[PDB]
Amino acid sequence: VVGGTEAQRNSWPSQISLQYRSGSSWAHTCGGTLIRQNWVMTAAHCVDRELTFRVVVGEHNLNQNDGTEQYVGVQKIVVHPYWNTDDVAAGYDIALLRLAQSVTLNSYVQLGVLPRAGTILANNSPCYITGWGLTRTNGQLAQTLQQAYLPTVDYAICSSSSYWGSTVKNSMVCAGGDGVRSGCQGDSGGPLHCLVNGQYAVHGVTSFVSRLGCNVTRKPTVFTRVSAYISWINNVIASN
Numbered sequence: 001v002v003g004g005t006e007a008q009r010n011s012w013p014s015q016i017s018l019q020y021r022s023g024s025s026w027a028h029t030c031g032g033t034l035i036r037q038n039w040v041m042t043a044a045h046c047v048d049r050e051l052t053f054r055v056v057v058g059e060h061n062l063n064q065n066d067g068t069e070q071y072v073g074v075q076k077i078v079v080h081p082y083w084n085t086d087d088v089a090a091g092y093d094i095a096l097l098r099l100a101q102s103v104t105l106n107s108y109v110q111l112g113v114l115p116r117a118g119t120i121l122a123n124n125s126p127c128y129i130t131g132w133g134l135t136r137t138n139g140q141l142a143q144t145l146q147q148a149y150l151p152t153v154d155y156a157i158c159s160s161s162s163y164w165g166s167t168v169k170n171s172m173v174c175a176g177g178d179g180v181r182s183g184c185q186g187d188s189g190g191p192l193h194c195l196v197n198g199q200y201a202v203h204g205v206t207s208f209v210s211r212l213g214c215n216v217t218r219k220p221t222v223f224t225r226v227s228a229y230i231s232w233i234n235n236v237i238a239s240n
């Protein structure tokens with residue numbers, strides 16, 4: 001997250017760190033959202049590589065003992081069947097991870113609330129992106145979980161020529177684009193939390209930003225629109 005602030009330890013208890021095994025250690029690669037005690041929602045592109053993955057829930061600082069973490073292996077990966085790695089602009093950037101054990105819920109570990117199917121946010125709706133992604137284009141990961149205020153940019157504006165044009169689809173949510181605050185490498189797969197009727201829900205799964213940089217004016221961060229996938233999510237969980 002570029003232009004973020006440090007999240008309070010208990011603000012976003014559904015945020016997870018998706019990590020892969022790297023020699024004798026684990027490396028953060030993406031975010032995700034805990035949606036059942038044994039299921040995580042992330043981006044399809046986060047799991048294109050044939051790696052060994054684990055999920056960390058109750059994580060705040062990637063590099064220090066928080067005293068709240070639970071570490072769990074990924075048992076099964078279900079990518080959206082229409083996902084195509086060489087065509088992120090097509091959409092379908094979403095995957096579900098079944099965890100090897102069911103995590104224990106507490107103030108640091110909670111299920112993410114998903115929007116009702118079909119829900120579209122009004123332009124300029126209040127949202128926060130969260131994650132441990134780069135704090136500058138071509139920078140380095142955050143140590144502590146970051147948040148940035150990223151109001152939505154509706155489809156009409158987002159798909160206009162000076163924004164993303166044809167690259168953005170109605171199956172996506174755009175947010176931000178102010179040139180200061182943005183998602184960035186390592187935030188992918190994580191949540192966009194939006195306040196609706198007094199309650200935060202996870203409306204987006206972080207998918208992409210500009211090849212030119214993270215915080216680029218009129219290139220808002222683009223997210224998979226969770227409310228487009230409710231039936232798919234329910235279908236996967238019910239058959240697995």
Ligand SMILES: *C(=O)[C@H](O)CNC(=O)NCc1ccccc1
Binds near residue numbers: 137188
């Ligand atoms: C998931 O985290 C995202 O896909 C992140 N994407 C980027 O951060 N892309 C911008 C970028 C700029 C310069 C070099 C590499 C990537």
Ligand code: NA
Binds near residue numbers: 065066069
């Ligand atoms: Na930690």
